[PDB]
Design a protein around this ligand. Structure first.
Ligand SMILES: CN1CCN(c2ccc3[nH]c(-c4c(N)c5c(F)cccc5[nH]c4=O)nc3c2)CC1
Ligand SMILES: CN1CCN(c2ccc3[nH]c(-c4c(N)c5c(F)cccc5[nH]c4=O)nc3c2)CC1
Lengths: 269, 275
């Protein structure tokens, strides 16, 4: 097994239904990587979707996309197949942890990392693709504080007990690709995720779960697209405009990645 | 029924909304054919389009065009009584050009270039006789026992077909149709529409088998990019270069900037025949 003989497992980065992401160190070069191990049935339609995503990722080359190193399938003894995808390890945390540590206070940085997410999103989009998985836990920063878009994959969580609405990854998922009214996945979906991601980028960390659920669900309202009182039309204004344009219920009223880059609302690089 | 009495069905070659193509065997001569069965209605303007096609298809004689044998109408069944049109054409033993690309054509540079010249010979003929094909796709170009090109007849934003679930754009048949024919139709009927499809066909012939659906959709949509016709990074110049110059010639977004079939056969980009 190539994984256990060539790589030194260092730390678990993520876990879930997909499988896991591990911080590893190649024994030969000595660099750290984020190897994604997915348990697969090489006969299933699931295998056709991952092999299809490995093909697409190996063809993506952008400064703001997470770098692809290698992908291989391994067969394990009687407890079975595993698919490994070796990708770059972005040393300087995720965008999630960058927001939680006060990104909002540094407007100059805030606007730079946003532009970078747009550059990489534009590249993905101009190569005719939809990400479907743009969330702060899947956008990272390297040693040089650059954005690296990751690869592609009522509420008990509320301590007050009174909150209703969507929670987690669902808060980033476009309204058109939800419910019974499943109005076809578009590239405009990736831009809805980016309008939620930019609000969080532009707003103070939401310390409590009750605060996060209320604030993000009120922003997602088609009959009331919010913005908290402390997110004033005075000091933000252009930020509020970008967020409101991207979060426009009508998938057709949303800009293109290139439209927002060639827009006056975004400061110059 | 002439079809059931005079012929014996051996295999289904293809299907669709148009009708179907079935490999038959004539009981009198012992030869196999490709009978294209079309459900029709004689009082419709669609039938008068089909009749006109049988009229033109019967006037074409070139070694690189699928030979036409006979055409007839058959009133079959009872309810309000269905009408069918049969077209009996040549059966090409070897394969389709699709199954030649998929079984690695891109390697044999002497076969690749020959097969392409043969497609241009047939296409130059159809164009001389004042016609446009509009069905030039690797599934409608065949190869007979002697490994020769036979151009078939003319039988007139997430893409759900993609297993990954990320790809956007053109899928299947739309991948060969000229951009002047889709969206903005002002002169969507030129002979240069055929020459565009030939660029996509020559790309596939010159490039490795794209066995994945996700690969074929990505690779072919990148080439069809109006703003910038991409081309893969795998597609060398040390073993190609002329091949790439021809593909670019043919795929020019502007139909005026594409060659004519006889212009390209006269071009020095094309290595001369030695057979
Ligand atoms: C409390 N906080 C938890 C998350 N902490 C963390 C730190 C570094 C991290 N690098 C990656 C990472 C990926 N997750 C990754 C991927 F999922 C797919 C492809 C490439 C990737 N590259 C990465 O570099 N995640 C990190 C999380 C920071 C502390
Ligand atoms: C390698 N695999 C073999 C079986 N398969 C096959 C083999 C031979 C074939 N010939 C024709 C064929 C036509 N389709 C045809 C037409 F569509 C209109 C007019 C004349 C035609 N003559 C043909 O000979 N199809 C074939 C399919 C698919 C490829």
């Amino acid at each position: 097994s190539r994984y256990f003989i060539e790589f030194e497992e260092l730390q678990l980065l993520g876990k879930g239904a997909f499988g896991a992401v591990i911080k590893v160190q190649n024994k030969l070069d000595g660099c750290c990587y984020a190897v994604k191990r997915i348990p697969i049935n090489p006969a299933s339609r699931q295998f056709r979707r991952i092999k299809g995503e490995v093909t697409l990722l190996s063809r993506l080359h952008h400064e703001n996309i997470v770098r692809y190193y290698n992908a291989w399938i391994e067969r394990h003894e009687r407890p079975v197949h595993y698919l490994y995808i070796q990708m770059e390890y972005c040393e300087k945390s995720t965008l999630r942890d960058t927001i939680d540590q006060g990104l909002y206070r540094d407007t100059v940085r805030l606007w730079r990392l946003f532009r970078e997410i747009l550059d990489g999103l534009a590249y993905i989009h101009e190569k005719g693709m939809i990400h479907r998985n743009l969330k702060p836990v899947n956008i990272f920063l390297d040693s040089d504080d650059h954005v690296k878009i990751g690869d592609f994959g009522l509420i008990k969580s509320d301590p007050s007990g009174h909150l209703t609405g969507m929670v987690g990854t669902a808060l980033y998922v476009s309204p058109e690709v939800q419910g019974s009214t499943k109005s076809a996945y578009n590239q405009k979906v990736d831009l809805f995720s980016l309008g939620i991601i930019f609000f969080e980028m532009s707003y103070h960390p939401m310390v409590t779960a009750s605060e996060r659920i209320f604030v993000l669900n009120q922003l997602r309202d088609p009959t009331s697209p919010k913005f908290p009182e402390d997110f004033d039309d005075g000091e933000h204004a252009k930020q509020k405009s970008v967020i409101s344009w991207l979060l426009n219920h009508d998938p057709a009223k949303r800009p293109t990645a290139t439209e927002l880059l060639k827009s006056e609302l975004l400061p110059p690089p």
